[PDB]
Amino acid sequence: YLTHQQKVLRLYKRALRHLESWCIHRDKYRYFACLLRARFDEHKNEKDMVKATQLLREAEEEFWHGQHPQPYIFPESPGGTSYERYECYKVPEWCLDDWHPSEKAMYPDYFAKREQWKKLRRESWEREVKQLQEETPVGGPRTEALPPARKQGDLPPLWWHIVTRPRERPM
Amino acid sequence: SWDKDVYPEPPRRTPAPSPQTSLPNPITYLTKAFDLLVDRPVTLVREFIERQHAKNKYYYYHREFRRVPDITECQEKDVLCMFEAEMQWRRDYKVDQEIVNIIQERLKACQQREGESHRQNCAKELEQFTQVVKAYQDRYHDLGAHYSARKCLAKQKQRMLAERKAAKEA
Amino acid sequence: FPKYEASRLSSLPTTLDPAEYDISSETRKAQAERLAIRSRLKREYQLQYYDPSRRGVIEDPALVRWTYARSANIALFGIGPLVFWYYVFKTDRDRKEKLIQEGKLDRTFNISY
Amino acid sequence: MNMFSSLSLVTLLLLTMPIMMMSFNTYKPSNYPLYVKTAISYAFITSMIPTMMFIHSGQELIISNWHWLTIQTLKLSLSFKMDYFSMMFIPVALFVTWSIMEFSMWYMYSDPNINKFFKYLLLFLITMLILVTANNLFQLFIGWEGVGIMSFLLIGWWYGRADANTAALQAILYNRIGDIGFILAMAWFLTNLNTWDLQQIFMLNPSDSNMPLIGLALAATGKSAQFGLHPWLPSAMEGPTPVSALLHSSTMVVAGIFLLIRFYPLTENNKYIQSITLCLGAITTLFTAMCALTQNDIKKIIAFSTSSQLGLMMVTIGINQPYLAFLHICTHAFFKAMLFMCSGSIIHSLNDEQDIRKMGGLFKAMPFTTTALIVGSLALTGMPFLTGFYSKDLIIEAANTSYTNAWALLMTLIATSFTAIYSTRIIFFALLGQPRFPTLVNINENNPLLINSIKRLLIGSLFAGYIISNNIPPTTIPQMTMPYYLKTTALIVTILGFILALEISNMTKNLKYHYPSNAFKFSTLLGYFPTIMHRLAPYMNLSMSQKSSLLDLIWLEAILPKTISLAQMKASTLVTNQKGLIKLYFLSFLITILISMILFNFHE
Amino acid sequence: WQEDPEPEDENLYEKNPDSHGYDKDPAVDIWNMRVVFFFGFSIVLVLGSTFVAYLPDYRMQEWARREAERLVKYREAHGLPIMESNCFDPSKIQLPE
Amino acid sequence: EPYPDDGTGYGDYPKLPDRSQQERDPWYDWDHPDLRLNWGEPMHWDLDMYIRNRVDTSPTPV
Amino acid sequence: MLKYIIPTIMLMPLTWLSKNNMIWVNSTAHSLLISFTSLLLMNQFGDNSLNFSLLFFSDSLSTPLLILTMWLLPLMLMASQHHLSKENLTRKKLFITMLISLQLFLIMTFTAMELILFYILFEATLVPTLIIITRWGNQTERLNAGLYFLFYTLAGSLPLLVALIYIQNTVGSLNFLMLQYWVQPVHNSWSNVFMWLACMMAFMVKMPLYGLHLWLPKAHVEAPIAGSMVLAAVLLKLGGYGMLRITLILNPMTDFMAYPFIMLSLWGMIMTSSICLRQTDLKSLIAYSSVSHMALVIVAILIQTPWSYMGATALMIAHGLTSSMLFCLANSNYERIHSRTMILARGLQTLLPLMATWWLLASLTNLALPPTINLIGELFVVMSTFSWSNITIILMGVNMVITALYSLYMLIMTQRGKYTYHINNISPSFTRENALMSLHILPLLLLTLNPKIILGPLY
Ligand SMILES: CCCCCCCCCCCCO[C@@H]1O[C@H](CO)[C@@H](O[C@H]2O[C@H](CO)[C@@H](O)[C@H](O)[C@H]2O)[C@H](O)[C@H]1O
């Protein structure tokens, strides 16, 4: 699934981040990040892909030996301290349909504009289905990529749940 | 309030205040504030309620159960006599549970009252607790959930038989 | 670098998997066929998930198949453990009953049971 | 008596009033958190009057105000014990909770469910005061399980996060394992002494107390997170920072130690239990202090500090010094709660960043948090005459001069040295050096709720130990004669730990890259206890049920629904599959009559 | 074959946003809410709890305590044992052998 | 690949790799992000044991 | 007891003569009035039971079961009326009639003095229960669940019929008051071993005893909600109540005959609790939770001590309200998503906040949080089995750990985490559903303030 170039670049990013977790201090990190870059540049032009694969394989074993047992993780990345912290506050938009009319009356302007989005979704749906139908090979899609809208006044197929997803800090 | 003989207390011995400082005791002034702001209004409310109770005075009594023949005097399978004997035994069983509770409450109050000297000063309560527990255990312990006067008697006669045999060998 | 020893609860990292780098062309073909199945199912799901008029649950046959299989078919389960505990408790209670009969178990304040 | 008893109860009743108002809709939601914070502060005031009365004359009493239930010869009353331990602990818990609640008004200001959060904090406190004032084991059990369940709800506050839910259930798992010991002690005391009341337990003073006390030691091991049942306390850092401050200082974790202090009249006569708690505390204090040496999350460092300090309290129990163990509980509550509040200040100012490797250069940018962090670190490390010194210093001397396990004593001194190291590690990486946080600088500690909350705990962290030390009545013969090298051991090894910590920290600046040692990986991954035990044990249990013996095959195959049903189905086809021929039916009549006379003599 | 299609599920809130969930008829829906709340909460739970609280000495627990006090007072005053091992008078018993 | 025929009762249910859901890519756009599952894909027999709240089989540095 | 039997019977003409749209209003209102009057049975004395007549009697054991029985009928009516909305009127009335007739048999079962009268009414409860499951259950398997339920019970009850008739011939009576006075010890012999088994196995299948339990998860998965409520709240307790009474005449043989059933229950409770951790069907999980809880009841009844009989009575009442509440909570989700799979709909606290509080309270009672009557009953059983043998504390302790694990796991999986994206018909909780939940939990938690009324005759 990953190409050789993709695997090399992912190792390079991964090794730098673990190197950064060992060094801590910026001047120390900058110094050793340059040595590491030099090692990658030492074989950038290796044309023999059999040798190149072995270099990649050996670099991965070297990384496994020298990885930080407790590397730095950005707080909201998977495994971070703030990961998924705000999922409890994310409420799907369809819940507003079940509001009592008295609750809806407190935001007359918000719910007026909400009807314009629901109307837009209703009048776009048939085109989106028919566009996907006529752009999909006989044996169904071969990838998960979706197409853009082709005409003016058309919306890209399957847009609602991307466009109206909850905000990252919804409360 | 309660019978002082059933629930005895010793005579309290408080020491008189003997200050050795010029600073005022904050507890003494808080006590005056508590008496004025808390106890006094509370007492007035109670005294009002006590006046109303006096206007309407009525009584309730403690039920007295006549003694009836016990299970030892009941002919085998004579349910009418066994019933009265069995209901009486159950009433006494509930009374003995409360007698042990009274003695346990004496022991617990003594331990708290005597402070760090409780091991020496609570000997009599401890000894009385030990005896009533022994007597209660002999009467009722190991009878099972379906206990009855009949099973209580069977247990006593077993104990009496072991006591007679032990003396016989002595 | 001592080699990685995988276990049941500690699996081999992908970057250390020798099969990860020795991609043939029939392995590429298998990967392309797996993605086709995933994409075909993704489309089927999305055409219902995005439908404005749908209100309910998108029934998933995979989930129904899993629960159906897991609920079928109605040593820790036979007579072994029952026998083992029987001899543990019977032995303990025989010893206790013997002591009580000989008057050698302390029950001085035991009047609750 | 009337003022003392009346004010002891208003304190507890006062705390339940905000709960009443919420659950009956008769309060102002605009500032429920302020209302809850005000109730705590008034409860602290009223609780200081009974405490003053006790300090004056040693006035103690028990209130058995409500007869709840009588089981034959076991009478259960709602019974409150206003004694030495209740009188001293309640004001400390209320004073600290007062700071934590004022701090939470700033820290949780953006939480949509702040009102529920403050209700949970108040319930979490009430269950602790039930635990502390309980006079019988059933009532104590109510508070025991109450703090556990409140911990579950507050650790799993952000319930959309799987790790938060996992940590919340982990706390329940480890604490219910300890609860096996609590129920064991309850069962033993009922069967052998006919009571759950502390008065009768102490009066009967059983000599054969191994079984009940091992049960209590197991309960304390879980609630205080001693070795074997320890991992849940570091994992509890999933909860919001105010939860960690309260969980780690004034409520849950010290309950295990407090349970053993309650029962010192039994443990002081049992050398065997003393030895067990001594060694259990010694391995706990060393092992968790070793783990803190390599942690990078600021909250986990302070979490391991609590475990290490709890182990020291368990060592104090083990050397027959219950009142010194209780003093450390009271002093530790101040600076430990303030260290968590200092860490929350830094985390907030750095956009929820908790890794110390991304801190640095905060000594001047956060002057007040810096001051509180330094004071708290010095108090924790036993700097002379700060609040931590008036307990730890006496504890190390008591252990040095006792008839004691030699290995446990050595492990305790090394852990004291390690305390200086991870305390240095926080200060060095959080406050010193150059900044390592992102470029957009939103550092701001200038909220009055933040400054005032920390300020009160800072004043407590300087003077509380001195004030408490000089007011409590003596209950032991403190040991004051010893060689110079046993008198100053704590101060020396603490100083050595600081000097060594500097060397190690400053070597992180040299342009040398090191491979990890095996000792470093052991410390970083917490001895592999969570990695091995939290995978293996769940795997065994979870595959236990969702899962061959021939003996069982006989009985199962015999009396299955499928086997019985097949038999009748087979018998039915034998009975019913007939040719319909007159000839065969009558021929069977002939056989029937013959065997009736020949085999069975029915003709006779 | 000749089978009716499966009907779509009905949301009671669509026709009646004030629905209590009891019935699709608004007037019946409200009445059914009131009987449940009045007979359930106002009567059974509130009056039933009050009834239970004032039961006259459930299983003579209080009488037994008063009776025990009377016996303890009498037996200590007269120097008798508080309680005896034998429940039944041995003079009324006749052992075998 | 089915489980080996025996008396357990798997039937023809697929035998899938004995891997935790914690090992799946967290950045991919799963239909069930918390479980890291896609609609329609076969669920491991022991999935309820391999959810992210329970048994982890992730590679370890040691 | 006629002051309860007759008004219960009158609920039938009331339902049939009601206006078309007032069948739910009328039957619910009047069955609550009957429930209210059931508190007059609290006139319990310390020595004598309340003996009304030659036929019926109440004591501290049957009284709490009677009040639970009569309180459950109105709750079953609120629980059922939504999923029966499309049923034709006559079939709705027949459904209500089956519930009314079940209450009539139950209140007579718990008050019968004579044991054959108990047997007949104990057996009569089968008919309406079977009809409710097989007629108004949802899926195909309800026909098999009816057959397993019927024949498990009859395989045990028919030997009981022989044993009871045998006992009357020998003793001369089966009146329970007489048996209290005419009871004679059971001597060792093979005849008495089978008399003991014939007297007990019918009640063991009802509890159900571990190893004889597999019918229960089938019945619950297939039954409608009212069927589950009565099954879990009261019908299982017929076995417990029967055993509590009939053990009077099986002494001392119970001393050793209990061992195989104590081992099954002590081990069975750990296995069923662990099974709950891996269940995928929410109704099946709650059914296994019931087997685990009832295992303690069997142990408590078999060891025959005052503390265990008090623990058994309290657990029976506490389990009835808790398990019935859990089924109602599970059903309210089912009426939205039409599936019992526990993993299907997650993160529901985000969408139904108050209903998530009912889940929390129900789970806390299931894991027996002090001072709930669930804990009081469990604690009393744990105390008494410790005296029976100290080692049992380990099995009891492990079960309490596992019980907390699956109780919270059920709460965490359904209420926490991220909501399922594609499920978008999670409408707000109805007043009926919230009232239904609170009519379980409120009486349950109020009983904490006055536990004695559920501790049975040994109190
Ligand atoms: C302790 C005493 C217990 C007494 C129990 C009461 C007796 C009940 C008698 C039922 C006997 C007949 O029950 C019958 O069993 C077979 C099982 O093979 C079922 O038959 C079913 O299973 C078999 C294989 O298992 C298939 O080949 C068959 O196609 C299928 O219909 C019948 O659908 C069922 O009606």
Q: Could you write out the three-class secondary structure of D487-509?
A: HCHHHHHHHHHHHHHHHHHHHCC
CA-nearest residue for atom 5, ligand 1, is G151
In angstroms, what is the span from residue D564 Cα to ligand 1's centroid? 8
G213 bridge partner residues:
none
Q: Report in angstroms the alpha-carbon separations of G183 from A7, B150, E44.
A: 85, 10, 40
Residue with tokens 């009539």: G104
Alpha-carbon span A69 to A66, nearest angstrom: 9
Q: Of the candidates D73, D544, D549, which has its C-beta nearest C80's C-beta?
A: D549
Residue to probe by mutation, ligand 1, list D557, D569, D576, most atoms within 8 Å of CB: D569
**Structure-token pair, residue A3:** 């190409």
Nearest CA to D290 among D528, D532, D520, D508? D520
- Dihedral of CA atoms A106, A110, A112, A118 in degrees, nearest 10, equals -130
CB-count burial class (<10 Å; 0-12, 13-18, 19+) for A140: middle
DSSP label at B152? H
| Chain B residues touching residue E76 (CB < 8 angstroms) | 5
**Structure-token pair, residue D579:** 């040719």
Resolution in A: 2.3
Binding-face residues of C in 69-108 toward B, CB within 8 A: 107-108
CB of A102 less than 8 A from some CB of G = no
Q: How many residues does chain E have?
A: 97
For residues C47 and A92, is the Cβ–Cβ distance under 8 A?
Answer: no
For residues A103 and A50, is the Cβ–Cβ distance under 8 A?
Answer: no
Nearest CA to F7 among D562, D26, G358? D562
Helices (H), D194-297: 198-204, 210-223, 232-235, 241-249, 255-262, 264-267, 271-292
Q: Which chains touch C (3 or more CB pairs under 8 A)?
A: A, B, D, F, G
At B29 the three-state DSSP class reads: helix
Nearest CA to G49 among G168, G180, G167, G184? G180
- Dihedral of CA atoms D576, D578, D580, D581 in degrees, nearest 10, equals -150
Alpha-carbon span A141 to A143, nearest angstrom: 6
Shortest CA distance from D535: residue in chain F = F55
Shortest CA distance from G426: residue in chain A = A95
| Chain B residues touching residue E83 (CB < 8 angstroms) | 96, 99-100, 132, 135-136, 139
Q: How many CA atoms lie within 13 A of F52 on its CB side?
A: 22
DSSP label at B36? I
Nearest CA to G262 among G391, G157, G80, G139? G391
In sequence order, what are the residues at sequence separation of 6 or more whose Cβ sits closer than 8 angstroms to the Cβ of residue D130? Answer: D139, D140, D142, D143, D146
Q: With residue D10 as reference, give the H or E element that holds it.
A: helix D2-23
Ligand 1 pocket residue status of D558, Cβ below 6 Å: no
CB contact under 8 A, G22 and E28: yes
Nearest CA to G166 among G157, G176, G174? G174
In sequence order, what are the residues at sequence separation of 6 or more whose Cβ sits closer than 8 angstroms to the Cβ of residue G441? Answer: G321, G325, G358, G361, G362, G365
Convert E10-31 to b/e letters by CB count within 10 Å (16 or more is b). Answer: eebbeeeeebbbbbeeeebbeb
CB of D584 less than 8 A from some CB of B = no
CB-count burial class (<10 Å; 0-12, 13-18, 19+) for A109: exposed
For residues F46 and C69, is the Cβ–Cβ distance under 8 A?
Answer: no
CB contact under 8 A, F55 and D165: no
Q: Report in angstroms the alpha-carbon separations of C70 from C67, D538, D546, G144, G390.
A: 5, 19, 9, 19, 38
Residue with tokens 């509380």: D464
For residues D73 and B104, is the Cβ–Cβ distance under 8 A?
Answer: yes
**Structure-token pair, residue G137:** 């259950």
Shortest CA distance from C48: residue in chain G = G422
CB of G428 less than 8 A from some CB of A = yes
Convert A143-171 to b/e letters by CB count within 10 Å (16 or more is b). Answer: eeebeeeeeeeebebbbbeeeeeeeeeee
CB contact under 8 A, A88 and G350: yes
Alpha-carbon span G451 to E59, nearest angstrom: 13
Shortest CA distance from G79: residue in chain E = E22
In sequence order, what are the residues at sequence separation of 6 or more whose Cβ sits closer than 8 angstroms to the Cβ of residue B2? Answer: none
Shortest CA distance from C53: residue in chain G = G424
In sequence order, what are the residues at sequence separation of 6 or more whose Cβ sits closer than 8 angstroms to the Cβ of residue G48? Answer: B87
In angstroms, what is the span from residue D377 Cα to ligand 1's centroid? 76
Residue with tokens 């309960």: D219
Please list the helix, strand and coil fractions of chain C in percent, rounded to the nearest 5, in that order.
55, 0, 40
φ, ψ dihedrals at E83, nearest 5°: -155, 145
Q: Work out how many CB contacts closer than 8 A connect C with F.
A: 58
Alpha-carbon span G357 to G349, nearest angstrom: 8
> Most distant CA pair in chain A: distance in Å?
72
In sequence order, what are the residues at sequence separation of 6 or more whose Cβ sits closer than 8 angstroms to the Cβ of residue D529? Answer: D230, D231
Nearest CA to D455 among D102, D92, D46? D102
φ, ψ dihedrals at D232, nearest 5°: -65, -30
- Dihedral of CA atoms B76, B78, B80, B86 in degrees, nearest 10, equals 10
**Structure-token pair, residue G30:** 């009047």
In angstroms, what is the span from residue D565 Cα to ligand 1's centroid? 4
| Chain G residues touching residue A161 (CB < 8 angstroms) | 421
At F37 the three-state DSSP class reads: strand
Neighbours of C29 (CB within 10 A): 10
Residue with tokens 């108040």: D122
Nearest CA to E84 among E93, E75, E92? E75
Q: Of the candidates B31, B115, B119, which has its C-beta nearest D3's C-beta?
A: B31
Please list the helix, strand and coil fractions of chain G in percent, rounded to the nearest 5, in that order.
75, 0, 25
Q: Report the nearest atom of ligand 1 relative to the CA of D562.
A: 17
Binding-face residues of G in 347-376 toward C, CB within 8 A: none
For residues G324 and G76, is the Cβ–Cβ distance under 8 A?
Answer: no
Radius of gyration for chain G, computed over Cα atoms and rounded to the nearest angstrom: 21
Alpha-carbon span G148 to G202, nearest angstrom: 14
Nearest CA to A121 among C53, C58, G426? C53
Alpha-carbon span G106 to G122, nearest angstrom: 8
**Structure-token pair, residue C13:** 């990292």
Q: With residue D61 as reference, give the H or E element that holds it.
A: strand D61-71
DSSP label at E45? I
| Chain G residues touching residue B144 (CB < 8 angstroms) | 251, 304-305
At A136 the three-state DSSP class reads: coil
Q: Contacts by G53-57 with C-beta closer than 8 Å and gap 24+? A: G53/G1, G54/G113, G55/G1, G55/G112, G55/G113, G55/G114, G55/G117, G56/G1, G56/G108, G56/G111, G56/G112, G56/G113, G57/G111, G57/G113, G57/G176, G57/G177
Alpha-carbon span D349 to D158, nearest angstrom: 20
Q: Report in angstroms the alpha-carbon separations of D242 from D102, D334, D341, D344, G320.
A: 10, 14, 7, 8, 39
For residues D436 and D357, is the Cβ–Cβ distance under 8 A?
Answer: yes
**Structure-token pair, residue E39:** 């007979």
Alpha-carbon span D297 to D415, nearest angstrom: 20
Ligand 1 pocket residue status of G155, Cβ below 6 Å: yes
In sequence order, what are the residues at sequence separation of 6 or more whose Cβ sits closer than 8 angstroms to the Cβ of residue D192? Answer: C106, C109, C110, D206, D212
Ligand 1 pocket residue status of D351, Cβ below 6 Å: no
CB contact under 8 A, D162 and A66: no
Binding-face residues of D in 447-506 toward B, CB within 8 A: none
CB contact under 8 A, G46 and B79: no
Alpha-carbon span G334 to G326, nearest angstrom: 12
Q: Which chains touch A (3 or more CB pairs under 8 A)?
A: C, D, E, F, G
At G21 the three-state DSSP class reads: helix
Q: How many CA atoms lie within 13 A of D99 on its CB side?
A: 30
| C-alpha angle C9-C12-C17 in degrees, rounded to nearest 5 | 165
Shortest CA distance from A78: residue in chain F = F26
Q: Which of B71, B146, B147 to mutate to test the interface with G (most CBs of G within 10 A)?
A: B146
Alpha-carbon span D132 to D11, nearest angstrom: 13
Ligand 1 pocket residue status of D23, Cβ below 6 Å: no
Alpha-carbon span A21 to D436, nearest angstrom: 12
